[PDB]
Design an enzyme around this catalytic site. Structure first.
Site, PDB file in Angstrom:
ATOM      1  N   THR A 184       1.139  -1.432 -18.870  1.00  5.44           N
ATOM      2  CA  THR A 184       2.334  -0.791 -19.470  1.00  5.44           C
ATOM      3  C   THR A 184       3.148  -0.106 -18.373  1.00  5.44           C
ATOM      4  OG1 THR A 184       1.427   1.384 -19.929  1.00  5.44           O
ATOM      5  CG2 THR A 184       0.922  -0.377 -21.512  1.00  5.44           C
ATOM      6  N   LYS A 192       7.005 -12.880 -13.011  1.00  8.35           N
ATOM      7  CA  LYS A 192       5.644 -12.482 -13.440  1.00  8.35           C
ATOM      8  C   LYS A 192       4.937 -13.561 -14.249  1.00  8.35           C
ATOM      9  CE  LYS A 192       5.204  -8.518 -11.441  1.00  8.35           C
ATOM     10  NZ  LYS A 192       4.333  -8.478 -10.263  1.00  8.35           N
ATOM     11  N   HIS A 196       0.827  -1.225   0.000  1.00 10.47           N
ATOM     12  CA  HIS A 196       0.000   0.000   0.000  1.00 10.47           C
ATOM     13  C   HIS A 196       0.858   1.271   0.000  1.00 10.47           C
ATOM     14  CE1 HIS A 196       0.833   0.035   4.309  1.00 10.47           C
ATOM     15  NE2 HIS A 196       0.430   1.317   4.305  1.00 10.47           N
ATOM     16  N   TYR A 251      12.663 -10.694 -13.518  1.00 10.84           N
ATOM     17  CA  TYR A 251      11.328 -10.212 -13.086  1.00 10.84           C
ATOM     18  C   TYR A 251      10.279 -10.826 -14.000  1.00 10.84           C
ATOM     19  CZ  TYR A 251       8.072  -6.966 -10.804  1.00 10.84           C
ATOM     20  OH  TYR A 251       7.055  -6.443 -10.044  1.00 10.84           O
ATOM     21  N   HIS A 257      12.745   3.437 -12.693  1.00 11.15           N
ATOM     22  CA  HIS A 257      12.237   3.172 -14.054  1.00 11.15           C
ATOM     23  C   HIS A 257      12.384   4.427 -14.915  1.00 11.15           C
ATOM     24  CE1 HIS A 257      11.018  -1.021 -14.274  1.00 11.15           C
ATOM     25  NE2 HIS A 257      10.748  -0.932 -12.957  1.00 11.15           N
ATOM     26  N   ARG A 260       7.405   3.253 -26.250  1.00 14.04           N
ATOM     27  CA  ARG A 260       6.455   2.433 -25.475  1.00 14.04           C
ATOM     28  C   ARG A 260       5.330   3.325 -24.958  1.00 14.04           C
ATOM     29  NH1 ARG A 260       9.714   0.645 -20.155  1.00 14.04           N
ATOM     30  NH2 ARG A 260      11.264  -0.042 -21.724  1.00 14.04           N
ATOM     31  N   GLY A 313       3.458   1.782  -2.003  1.00 12.38           N
ATOM     32  CA  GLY A 313       4.097   1.943  -3.305  1.00 12.38           C
ATOM     33  C   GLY A 313       3.274   2.832  -4.234  1.00 12.38           C
ATOM     34  N   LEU A 314       3.714   2.928  -5.464  1.00 10.81           N
ATOM     35  CA  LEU A 314       3.122   3.787  -6.497  1.00 10.81           C
ATOM     36  C   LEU A 314       1.674   3.353  -6.705  1.00 10.81           C
ATOM     37  CD1 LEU A 314       3.306   5.772  -8.947  1.00 10.81           C
ATOM     38  CD2 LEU A 314       4.130   3.779 -10.231  1.00 10.81           C
TER      39      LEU A 314
HETATM   40  N1  LIG Z   1       5.618   0.903 -11.924  1.00  7.06           N
HETATM   41  C1  LIG Z   1       5.487   0.434 -13.166  1.00  7.06           C
HETATM   42  O1  LIG Z   1       5.868   1.033 -14.201  1.00  7.06           O
HETATM   43  C2  LIG Z   1       4.786  -0.863 -13.301  1.00  7.06           C
HETATM   44  C3  LIG Z   1       4.280  -1.557 -12.229  1.00  7.06           C
HETATM   45  N2  LIG Z   1       3.634  -2.748 -12.422  1.00  7.06           N
HETATM   46  C4  LIG Z   1       3.435  -3.694 -11.306  1.00  7.06           C
HETATM   47  O2  LIG Z   1       2.686  -3.058 -10.310  1.00  7.06           O
HETATM   48  C5  LIG Z   1       3.025  -3.636  -9.025  1.00  7.06           C
HETATM   49  C6  LIG Z   1       3.302  -2.480  -8.097  1.00  7.06           C
HETATM   50  O3  LIG Z   1       4.455  -1.780  -8.622  1.00  7.06           O
HETATM   51  P1  LIG Z   1       4.804  -0.329  -8.094  1.00  7.06           P
HETATM   52  O4  LIG Z   1       3.674   0.284  -7.324  1.00  7.06           O
HETATM   53  O5  LIG Z   1       5.498   0.423  -9.205  1.00  7.06           O
HETATM   54  O6  LIG Z   1       5.872  -0.692  -6.986  1.00  7.06           O
HETATM   55  P2  LIG Z   1       6.580   0.108  -5.799  1.00  7.06           P
HETATM   56  O7  LIG Z   1       8.045  -0.190  -5.829  1.00  7.06           O
HETATM   57  O8  LIG Z   1       6.175   1.512  -6.011  1.00  7.06           O
HETATM   58  O9  LIG Z   1       5.861  -0.461  -4.501  1.00  7.06           O
HETATM   59  C7  LIG Z   1       6.297  -1.735  -3.959  1.00  7.06           C
HETATM   60  C8  LIG Z   1       5.554  -1.952  -2.661  1.00  7.06           C
HETATM   61  O10 LIG Z   1       5.877  -3.273  -2.156  1.00  7.06           O
HETATM   62  C9  LIG Z   1       6.365  -3.141  -0.847  1.00  7.06           C
HETATM   63  N3  LIG Z   1       7.279  -4.210  -0.516  1.00  7.06           N
HETATM   64  C10 LIG Z   1       8.513  -4.482  -1.071  1.00  7.06           C
HETATM   65  N4  LIG Z   1       9.109  -5.521  -0.530  1.00  7.06           N
HETATM   66  C11 LIG Z   1       8.187  -5.943   0.433  1.00  7.06           C
HETATM   67  C12 LIG Z   1       8.252  -6.956   1.414  1.00  7.06           C
HETATM   68  N5  LIG Z   1       9.285  -7.797   1.503  1.00  7.06           N
HETATM   69  N6  LIG Z   1       7.169  -7.104   2.214  1.00  7.06           N
HETATM   70  C13 LIG Z   1       6.159  -6.236   2.117  1.00  7.06           C
HETATM   71  N7  LIG Z   1       6.010  -5.230   1.282  1.00  7.06           N
HETATM   72  C14 LIG Z   1       7.092  -5.132   0.474  1.00  7.06           C
HETATM   73  C15 LIG Z   1       6.987  -1.750  -0.841  1.00  7.06           C
HETATM   74  O11 LIG Z   1       7.158  -1.246   0.447  1.00  7.06           O
HETATM   75  P3  LIG Z   1       8.640  -0.633   0.885  1.00  7.06           P
HETATM   76  O12 LIG Z   1       8.917   0.401  -0.166  1.00  7.06           O
HETATM   77  O13 LIG Z   1       8.384  -0.084   2.284  1.00  7.06           O
HETATM   78  O14 LIG Z   1       9.643  -1.709   0.851  1.00  7.06           O
HETATM   79  C16 LIG Z   1       5.858  -0.976  -1.523  1.00  7.06           C
HETATM   80  O15 LIG Z   1       4.723  -0.820  -0.680  1.00  7.06           O
HETATM   81  C17 LIG Z   1       4.209  -4.593  -9.297  1.00  7.06           C
HETATM   82  O16 LIG Z   1       3.774  -5.957  -9.407  1.00  7.06           O
HETATM   83  C18 LIG Z   1       4.733  -4.084 -10.631  1.00  7.06           C
HETATM   84  O17 LIG Z   1       5.479  -5.073 -11.358  1.00  7.06           O
HETATM   85  C19 LIG Z   1       3.289  -3.184 -13.702  1.00  7.06           C
HETATM   86  C20 LIG Z   1       3.502  -2.426 -14.740  1.00  7.06           C
HETATM   87  C21 LIG Z   1       4.484  -1.373 -14.705  1.00  7.06           C
HETATM   88  N1  LIG Z   2      15.938   3.439 -15.977  1.00  2.00           N
HETATM   89  C1  LIG Z   2      16.145   4.380 -16.963  1.00  2.00           C
HETATM   90  N2  LIG Z   2      15.901   4.073 -18.237  1.00  2.00           N
HETATM   91  C2  LIG Z   2      16.167   5.073 -19.159  1.00  2.00           C
HETATM   92  C3  LIG Z   2      16.652   6.404 -18.784  1.00  2.00           C
HETATM   93  N3  LIG Z   2      16.753   7.139 -19.932  1.00  2.00           N
HETATM   94  C4  LIG Z   2      16.374   6.365 -20.939  1.00  2.00           C
HETATM   95  N4  LIG Z   2      16.011   5.127 -20.473  1.00  2.00           N
HETATM   96  C5  LIG Z   2      15.501   4.064 -21.332  1.00  2.00           C
HETATM   97  O1  LIG Z   2      14.324   3.420 -20.802  1.00  2.00           O
HETATM   98  C6  LIG Z   2      14.374   1.988 -21.062  1.00  2.00           C
HETATM   99  C7  LIG Z   2      14.554   1.330 -19.699  1.00  2.00           C
HETATM  100  O2  LIG Z   2      13.266   1.463 -19.023  1.00  2.00           O
HETATM  101  P1  LIG Z   2      13.200   0.973 -17.485  1.00  2.00           P
HETATM  102  O3  LIG Z   2      11.934   1.482 -16.944  1.00  2.00           O
HETATM  103  O4  LIG Z   2      14.468   1.223 -16.726  1.00  2.00           O
HETATM  104  O5  LIG Z   2      13.094  -0.718 -17.683  1.00  2.00           O
HETATM  105  P2  LIG Z   2      12.040  -1.698 -18.364  1.00  2.00           P
HETATM  106  O6  LIG Z   2      10.670  -1.078 -18.231  1.00  2.00           O
HETATM  107  O7  LIG Z   2      12.219  -2.999 -17.578  1.00  2.00           O
HETATM  108  O8  LIG Z   2      12.492  -1.694 -19.792  1.00  2.00           O
HETATM  109  C8  LIG Z   2      15.583   1.826 -21.968  1.00  2.00           C
HETATM  110  O9  LIG Z   2      15.077   1.959 -23.297  1.00  2.00           O
HETATM  111  C9  LIG Z   2      16.509   2.930 -21.550  1.00  2.00           C
HETATM  112  O10 LIG Z   2      17.564   3.265 -22.487  1.00  2.00           O
HETATM  113  C10 LIG Z   2      16.943   6.598 -17.386  1.00  2.00           C
HETATM  114  O11 LIG Z   2      17.379   7.664 -16.912  1.00  2.00           O
HETATM  115  N5  LIG Z   2      16.650   5.558 -16.564  1.00  2.00           N
END
Ligand SMILES: NC(=O)C1=CN([C@@H]2O[C@H](COP(=O)(O)OP(=O)(O)OC[C@H]3O[C@@H](n4cnc5c(N)ncnc54)[C@H](OP(=O)(O)O)[C@@H]3O)[C@@H](O)[C@H]2O)C=CC1
Ligand SMILES: Nc1nc2c(ncn2[C@@H]2O[C@H](COP(=O)(O)OP(=O)(O)O)[C@@H](O)[C@H]2O)c(=O)[nH]1
Ligand SMILES: NC(=O)C1=CN([C@@H]2O[C@H](COP(=O)(O)OP(=O)(O)OC[C@H]3O[C@@H](n4cnc5c(N)ncnc54)[C@H](OP(=O)(O)O)[C@@H]3O)[C@@H](O)[C@H]2O)C=CC1
Ligand SMILES: Nc1nc2c(ncn2[C@@H]2O[C@H](COP(=O)(O)OP(=O)(O)O)[C@@H](O)[C@H]2O)c(=O)[nH]1
Lengths: 353, 354
Positions: free
Chosen positions: B167, B143, B14, B139, B182, B241, B16-17
């Protein structure tokens, strides 16, 4: 490389492969072998595996624990066969790393490979295409285990080595007619069909732990086995390779003595698809194997293939260039393995069924 | 609209993002029985802690938003960690949700499940049909295994474990650590810090980076080839993307939980095969297009340079969204508005993840 006094842990030591590795190391005089029954150490309990590894810190690990079954059990237990094997392997592999094990041998399976992989199957075909539906749960557990070894090797410099055997057979297998894999199932089915055909009522009683032939006939009718016929599953047309359990044990020990991470980098410098296939001999149809067993054990009845049951992948052959060039070869030919398994079957009083 | 206001709803991850956006939406909409624990309170990598939590709280609905992740360069280092940590967290949560008779669970997956050479736009049925992008394998394997675990539980036990495949996401509450972020939060934070340096806003830089003086700020930023004249980003900037705003993801998660069950997934495939649902909105953008748009919106005066000596990875990702579109889901937030909302939050927030 494994010294006589090296602490060697065999996980799943009661199983087909684990019992053969333990028996061979015991026979060859290794001094420091550790093992636990499922009752003594449940490898699905995270904290129990943590506690065991921290207390014992084995130098070598042979990972031979699994919950598996044949095609029909796999079509039912979709969740169980992913879940149970995912957690057992993840806890063992992780705690082997955390406790600075020297090398670990992970046993994988041909179901990692795409259904339509080019033949003979190369190790590089893993993750290159759609899996066999029947096997998906176990296949996903095994792909994840193979990849976990690669990633630990890359990030941590571990020596997590994977062998991918073909279908295995021999003494110590699961011969339960419902849950057995193809080789032990068809062997046990033909053997019971023979005892029935030859009115060997007492051997049937002793073998099946039943008391009268009404109960024997009722049990065997579930598989369309009677005094005249033994019915087997599917068309009998699927073809694959088979390997005798003692050859797999020998290959596991050979691999643990002779392979490390640096040698895997010769296949791929990023450890990508650096498992090793393990196979011996040509492909046989299930029907050829059935008729070979019938000849060897002298069954006089009919073998019928109930083509109303599923076949999956129709042809599997394995590229074994990596392990052949490393210097490993099988000792046991199919006819001799069948004879050794039969000899054991005729004398064993604690058969898995 | 089948979650009730009084339903026991657990949001894992909860803080996280995604998790924070879902929790905020449900709090704001008046849901009365929300359950959540920090990582400190509940380590989802501890089997017994997850068992104990599920037995005590018996949630009806689970939003699985916990994960340990990072950008491209962290993924190239932490091969073991990004498989292991995510495999065990999801396996414990999905299994205990089954063991404690949850009504539904929403599993969040990722586009890295798909083959690098999948036909575009990517269809859900392409999962496990080809070689993955090497960078993402750890990862991606976690997944794929999670997607398949939901299929298998659905088939063997009649669960309602539903998977959304978003995405790349962006928005408030992201990880903006310049080394681990990211691409979208990384380029936003780099350009923003580049802007402050270009404009001699030394105090804002000290407040933002928790550093005492300009020499220290300059040393830290010079790691990324950021200086008072320019901001260096990774790769060529040509990879393309889709991006989705966090609140649209939160809305889709809630919509999905209200509207999909196992019976509905069977309409895609009677054995639940590849019955996850892609989640995407909008066109594919190059990283250069997003960088230039951020530059324009925040008024950065400096140069944006792409360091071609660094990796690009997969050059084009687009997603087929016919499933979620036919179910009636639509995104609300356009890219320009999402960037402005993220920037507005960025200029207020005192606890940014950096
Ligand atoms: N962000 C993106 O671009 C994308 C996200 N998703 C998926 O969405 C989901 C959420 O991602 P996102 O919100 O970005 O992630 P975040 O990194 O923003 O959030 C991760 C969360 O998990 C918690 N967490 C990590 N390790 C543990 C642990 N051992 N026990 C309990 N809680 C833990 C973190 O808490 P703490 O920080 O306190 O450790 C935090 O609350 C993931 O499955 C991700 O793959 C899918 C598409 C793209
Ligand atoms: N993480 C990251 N990726 C970058 C940045 N600038 C460009 N990229 C590009 O973004 C892609 C990586 O995306 P990222 O979110 O790190 O990983 P992915 O979603 O697992 O591919 C590649 O095409 C990188 O070259 C940067 O500052 N950080
Ligand atoms: N047999 C074959 O055809 C092939 C086998 N392999 C691989 O070889 C490995 C060994 O297979 P095989 O020897 O046939 O398997 P078996 O079923 O014969 O043995 C499995 C072993 O695991 C133990 N085990 C199961 N659950 C647990 C648990 N929760 N905790 C601890 N121990 C447990 C079993 O003990 P118990 O019975 O007491 O539960 C037994 O010792 C597997 O990884 C398999 O995939 C690969 C190719 C083909
Ligand atoms: N399990 C099993 N398979 C059989 C039997 N007779 C034939 N087969 C065939 O062998 C194949 C299944 O092999 P099995 O070891 O169960 O599964 P797999 O190794 O995962 O493919 C199928 O074509 C079956 O039709 C039998 O009695 N039991």
């Amino acid at each position: 490389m494994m010294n006589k006094d090296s602490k060697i842990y065999i996980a799943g030591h009661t199983g087909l492969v684990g019992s053969s590795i333990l028996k061979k190391l015991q026979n060859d005089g290794y001094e420091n072998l550790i093992f636990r029954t499922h009752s003594e150490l449940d490898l699905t309990n995270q904290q129990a595996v943590t506690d065991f590894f921290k207390k014992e810190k084995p130098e070598y690990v042979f990972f031979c624990a699994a919950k598996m079954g044949g095609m029909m059990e796999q079509l039912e237990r979709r969740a169980d066969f992913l879940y149970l094997n995912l957690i057992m392997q993840t806890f063992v592999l992780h705690e082997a790393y955390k406790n600075d094990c020297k090398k670990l041998l992970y046993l994988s399976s041909l179901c990692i490979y795409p259904q339509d992989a080019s033949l003979p199957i190369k190790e590089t075909s893993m993750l290159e295409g759609k899996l066999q539906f029947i096997n998906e749960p176990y296949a996903v557990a095994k792909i994840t285990g193979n990849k976990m070894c690669e990633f630990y090797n890359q990030q941590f410099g571990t020596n997590f080595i994977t062998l991918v055997p073909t279908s295995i057979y021999g003494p110590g297998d699961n011969f339960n007619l419902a849950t057995a894999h193809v080789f032990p199932a068809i062997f046990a089915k033909i053997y019971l069909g023979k005892l029935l055909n030859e009115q060997k009522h007492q051997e049937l009683f002793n073998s099946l732990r039943l008391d009268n032939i009404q109960d024997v006939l009722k049990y065997l009718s579930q598989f369309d086995i009677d005094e005249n016929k033994v019915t087997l599953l599917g068309s009998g047309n699927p073809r694959r390779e088979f390997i005798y359990v003692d050859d797999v044990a020998d290959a596991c020990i050979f691999t643990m003595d002779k392979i490390d991470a640096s040698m895997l980098k010769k296949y791929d410098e990023n450890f990508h698809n650096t498992h090793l296939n393990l196979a011996d001999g040509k492909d046989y149809s299930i029907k050829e194997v059935a008729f070979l067993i019938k000849d060897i054990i002298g069954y006089k009845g009919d073998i019928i293939f109930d083509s109303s049951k599923l076949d999956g992948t129709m042809l599997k052959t394995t590229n074994t260039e990596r392990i052949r060039k490393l210097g490993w070869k099988a000792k046991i030919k199919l006819e001799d393995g069948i004879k050794m398994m039969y000899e054991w079957y005729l004398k064993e009083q604690n058969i898995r069924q």
